[PDB]
Amino acid sequence: PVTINNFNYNDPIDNNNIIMMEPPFARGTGRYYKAFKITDRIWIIPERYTFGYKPEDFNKSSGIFNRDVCEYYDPDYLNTNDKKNIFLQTMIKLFNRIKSKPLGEKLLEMIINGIPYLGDRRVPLEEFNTNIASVTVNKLISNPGEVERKKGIFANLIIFGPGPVLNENETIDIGIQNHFASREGFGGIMQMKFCPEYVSVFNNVQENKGASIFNRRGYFSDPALILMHELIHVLHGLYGIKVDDLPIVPNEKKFFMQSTDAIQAEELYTFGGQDPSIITPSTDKSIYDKVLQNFRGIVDRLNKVLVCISDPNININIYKNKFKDKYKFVEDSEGKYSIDVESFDKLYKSLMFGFTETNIAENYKIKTRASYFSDSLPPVKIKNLLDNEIYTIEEGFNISDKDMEKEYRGQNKAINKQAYEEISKEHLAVYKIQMCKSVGICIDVDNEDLFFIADKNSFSDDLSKNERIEYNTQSNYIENDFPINELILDTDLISKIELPSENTESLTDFNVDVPVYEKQPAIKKIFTDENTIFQYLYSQTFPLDIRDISLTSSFDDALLFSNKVYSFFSMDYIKTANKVVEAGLFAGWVKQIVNDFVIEANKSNTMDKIADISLIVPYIGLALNVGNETAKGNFENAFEIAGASILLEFIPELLIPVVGAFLLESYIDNKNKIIKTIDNALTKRNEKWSDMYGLIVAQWLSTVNTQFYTIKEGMYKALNYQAQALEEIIKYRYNIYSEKEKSNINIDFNDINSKLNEGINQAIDNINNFINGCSVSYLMKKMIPLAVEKLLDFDNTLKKNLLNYIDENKLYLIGSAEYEKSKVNKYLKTIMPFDLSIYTNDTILIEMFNKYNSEILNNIILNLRYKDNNLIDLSGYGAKVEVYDGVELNDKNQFKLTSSANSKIRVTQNQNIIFNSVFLDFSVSFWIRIPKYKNDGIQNYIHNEYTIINCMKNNSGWKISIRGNRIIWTLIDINGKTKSVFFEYNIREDISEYINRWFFVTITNNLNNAKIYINGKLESNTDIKDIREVIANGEIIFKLDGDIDRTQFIWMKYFSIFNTELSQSNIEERYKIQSYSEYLKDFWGNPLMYNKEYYMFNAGNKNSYIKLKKDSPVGEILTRSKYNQNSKYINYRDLYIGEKFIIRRKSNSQSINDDIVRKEDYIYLDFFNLNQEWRVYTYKYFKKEEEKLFLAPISDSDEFYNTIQIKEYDEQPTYSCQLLFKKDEESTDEIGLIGIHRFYESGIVFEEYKDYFCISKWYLKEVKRKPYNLKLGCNWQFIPKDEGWTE
Ligand SMILES: [Zn+2]
Ligand SMILES: [Zn+2]
């Protein structure tokens, strides 16, 4: 158990638990400090830490000590005896809180028992030397006013009050002769400068501080956790494992880069959470090896220690027993000490990954920042930690009896205001970057606000070094994890070996290195004319002495005029915001503009499914202009083209080493040591794959995810600025009214802020999801593939290495040099799938990753889309696309392959994507339009098969071909085995749904089957179990290849590939998404156009057509003529028959050239009667359900409706459209829909039924039924002449 002593500052010195100490950095000179033993080996000195600091530096100045902290100064802190006592009682309380839980009590016990080794690197192996400043510290015994009598004491930790900056707690170790015992296995007296009242403040990005931006936000820290965080540094120092290694160093070459001190791995381990993942596996092992090496030395010393020259009264056995337990060494029956690999592993992991701030916070239910790299905020002062009503040993601030236990409410600034106080900005110093334009206007930006982008030097290159493989050689994995539960329940973690007595010989050798500190300018001036995130956010603010502002979409005007504030919202939002109204309409205006704000912010949930992008925040570019000028042009389009990359302020240069060669050692005649060498090289090979992935994750987190973090913070600010600006305008407009008017104005400001704040929170969730998706995207598409390239390169080199090895040793392997020959091929065949959960256990990061992987659209590895008269890959994997001269492209994403040799597309796929899942798993989707057969060429049409898309690599791969009316999917495994599946449409149908008409194809492949879907419907299936490995990432050639007719061609659109099997549901959705359009379509599926001759087709009367009746103004319905020749293979009804109609636009006299017909458009349905253009009319006064339509010259009669509204009542894909007659555009008086009705005719000669072109009110209710009735006679399609259809 741990005992916390009690005492008051004014208690008498007793030379035992209350002494006059001579601090290590005092150098044996100067005065002593009253010190109190809070627990064994731990001392509290309630005075300011002054070592290495200038007295005047305790005052706030124009300088700062740390560039990444909002430094609070207060020279009066601890200047009275009562203040000192308050410090003592507070430390006593924090220590009691720490030991209130097993985990903290164990941290304390480990610290108390972790006594420094008696000596350091300079001491001979056979001795203990207590006479060094890192082991012995002195206390003055003699009466006051004379250093006549001193006495030495061993100590582990000395805690002082703060140095110049109250909120900059720090643990310091003792260096002597340029070396640190606490970094070389010995350990040494540790010191700390700590302040309990002025705690740090933080806020979660992916969260919301009490869902309030108008109130105080963020949470304040629990000083007990702040203390335990420093105690962890102490722990590492005491065990001599606070080693230095390759540090994370920030890139500072650009003005937008954050400047900070180098960050050591030990600091990231101490914090825990995701930070350890920023330390590559290479560096993890390097640190591991150094500490292990350190322990080897200590254990050798324990085997050689014979005497303690400095102090004859030191019992050697007692210390050997204690050090044996401290380091978990094992001892044989004789007394020989050695390192037990298992116990060392556990101790190491316990100290570096068990005791972490993150683990402790979770355990004590204390909230803390998410990452080391999180924006630091202004500190706050805690009123009274000694008041159990505000802070308790058991629960800290989160007291259940006050209902502050849930959601860390007790630490919430917006909730527990009675626990803290804000700090005077006059006492705060912050390092700023003053960005000046070469003129001049200057903007100050806190260094904290900039982009932290780790420099390339931050990462180890140990992967490039060679590895010697032996029958011994084994894997080396360090789990940056440690079950806190076992640690808390570990039985032999805490020593039960006697702590030696602290009294010893006085220290006479005060030699020690004392650090010297000094402030640096708090402001650094830089020159740049860039208008990036910093300037854009600045343009959205206004001076405090201004109360009348107006919004503007002009960024430059906003920067120029102090009364102009930039807004990235809609033009309409901006105009309404600057609108002035009479008192009577003010409340209405407020409701309006506030509602408009929420609508604008809500646009952050915009979808862009047609471009294969589920979520897009359209205004991010306008708001920050971050990255590659995202404020210019249209952000959505730019994002579709480049993706996540356009938002990054900087594109990092990744460290992706060529893995070092393997040197296998031979064992002539040893059939076992040789077999092992091969197996070990395989396992080692996997270690290289995992390590490389770890190296990627570290760079991603410290150079890419950090930038996206800043963008997220940037948006939160931009949104808040917009709300702040609107709030300001509302206040001004309201205050212009007299008191009498205000009384009759119904307004509630709190609720206004409430609604605005709500809109903001909703937008933040959308933005956070968008940005996280962008970050994972960059990792997966821009980083992982580059690593894979090298790893595959390494594989090959290793393959020819192992084979050649099995050759030179063929003899000593006799009848097996073949069994393992393939053993190598099958091992280096399966690559290691990247799994982020292996490199980190951070819930937020894992969820980000799993979410990304659950989105089917991220499985797209090729997506050919039209852009600037060219086809490019928008999958984000950078496939190279060469479109030769003979290919026809249009902005409707349609491309035509002709019989010309230059009508070809060459696609070189990214060879670095896990495509060969070792069992064939991928899909191909695209739209196609295949022209009708030539009647006089039916034999060749049905006989000649021709390839259209070929993807072959090493005589293996896939292919898409066509033979007449059949489309074929062919696979060819490495063995040459071939399998096919096909879809054949009928060429004898009176009316075909497929011939010369756009339709949707999707082919899916999995371990068992090959399925072909047509317009979302499964059509074919083929068992492909026999088929073996299929190489699919070869070059893709789009070209008509075979014995074709010179006239042969094929149109295609939206060709894409997925590296997974699409489900019927995915396909249906894709079919629906890609079928969607604002415009109507024609019979062939192309956009319906105005001023274009069209024959009419009726879906309910397929074989019927309209013809102006000879003697009357009506359209009789006749039967379509048909294919007349004698071929047995074909049949069809003529399509180019009947009147030739032409659709004319109704509104705006923009002439009759041509344009796209959209749903709901008002039109005139005309047709050519010889050399004249006639019109389709509806007699206004009919009372029956239907009536025949009236066809006549163009004219305007009061008795006939002449205006039609083209509609689309079908919710599902169809090329059919409906034609509605309304009383007039405005009215909701529907006359009826155009269709076909049957009439009975009985005359003097003929008796029969005849159908006519009509209008019926009956259809009005029928088109509402679900599912939509495709057979309805009011369903029409327009057929223009098309080269793809001849009759
Ligand atoms: Zn730290
Ligand atoms: Zn940072």
UniProtKB/Swiss-Prot annotation:
Outcome following mutation: K1188E: Greatly decreased binding of heavy chain to host SYT2, whole toxin about dramatically less toxic. Significantly decreased binding of heavy chain to host SYT1 and SYT2 independent of gangliosides; whole toxin significantly less toxic
Region called Translocation domain (TD), residue ranges: 440-853
GO terms, molecular function: lipid binding; metalloendopeptidase activity; protein transmembrane transporter activity; toxin activity; zinc ion binding
Region (Belt): 477-528
Pfam entry (one): Toxin_R_bind_C
Region (N-terminus of receptor binding domain (N-RBD)): 854-1075
Motif (Host ganglioside-binding motif): 1256-1259
Region (C-terminus of receptor binding domain (C-RBD)): 1076-1287
The entry's keywords: Disulfide bond, Host cell membrane, Host cytoplasm, Host cytoplasmic vesicle, Host membrane, Host synapse, Hydrolase, Lipid-binding, Membrane, Metal-binding, Metalloprotease, Neurotoxin, Pharmaceutical, Protease, Secreted, Toxin, Transmembrane, Virulence, Zinc
Binding site residues for Zn(2+): H229, H233, E267
Cofactor note: Binds 1 zinc ion per subunit, to the LC.
InterPro entries recorded: Bot/tetX_LC, Clostridium_toxin_transloc, ConA-like_dom_sf, Kunitz_inhibitor_STI-like_sf, Toxin_rcpt-bd_C, Toxin_rcpt-bd_N, Toxin_trans
A cellular component term, taken from the record's GO annotations: host cell plasma membrane
Outcome (variant: F1200A): Greatly decreased binding of heavy chain to host SYT2, whole toxin about 30-fold less toxic
Recorded superkingdom: Bacteria
Reactions mediated catalytically: Limited hydrolysis of proteins of the neuroexocytosis apparatus, synaptobrevins, SNAP25 or syntaxin. No detected action on small molecule substrates
Mutagenesis or variant effect for S1195Y: Increased binding of heavy chain to host SYT2, no effect on toxicity
Active site positions: E230
Catalytic activity, EC: 3.4.24.69
Family indicated by similarity: Belongs to the peptidase M27 family.
Additional free-text comment from the UniProt record: There are seven antigenically distinct forms of botulinum neurotoxin: Types A, B, C, D, E, F, and G; new subtypes are quite frequent.
Subunit structure of this chain's protein: Heterodimer; disulfide-linked heterodimer of a light chain (LC) and a heavy chain (HC). At pH 4.4 in the presence of ganglioside GT1b may form trimers. Interacts with host receptor synaptotagmin-1 (SYT1); interaction is improved in the presence of gangliosides. Interacts with host receptor synaptotagmin-2 (SYT2). SYT2 interaction and toxin uptake do not require gangliosides but are improved in their presence. HC interacts with a complex including at least host synaptic vesicle glycoprotein 2 (SV2) and synaptotagmin-1 (SYT1); copurification does not depend on glycosylation of either protein.
Protein name according to UniProt: Botulinum neurotoxin type B
Lineage: Bacteria, Bacillati, Bacillota, Clostridia, Eubacteriales
Gene: botB
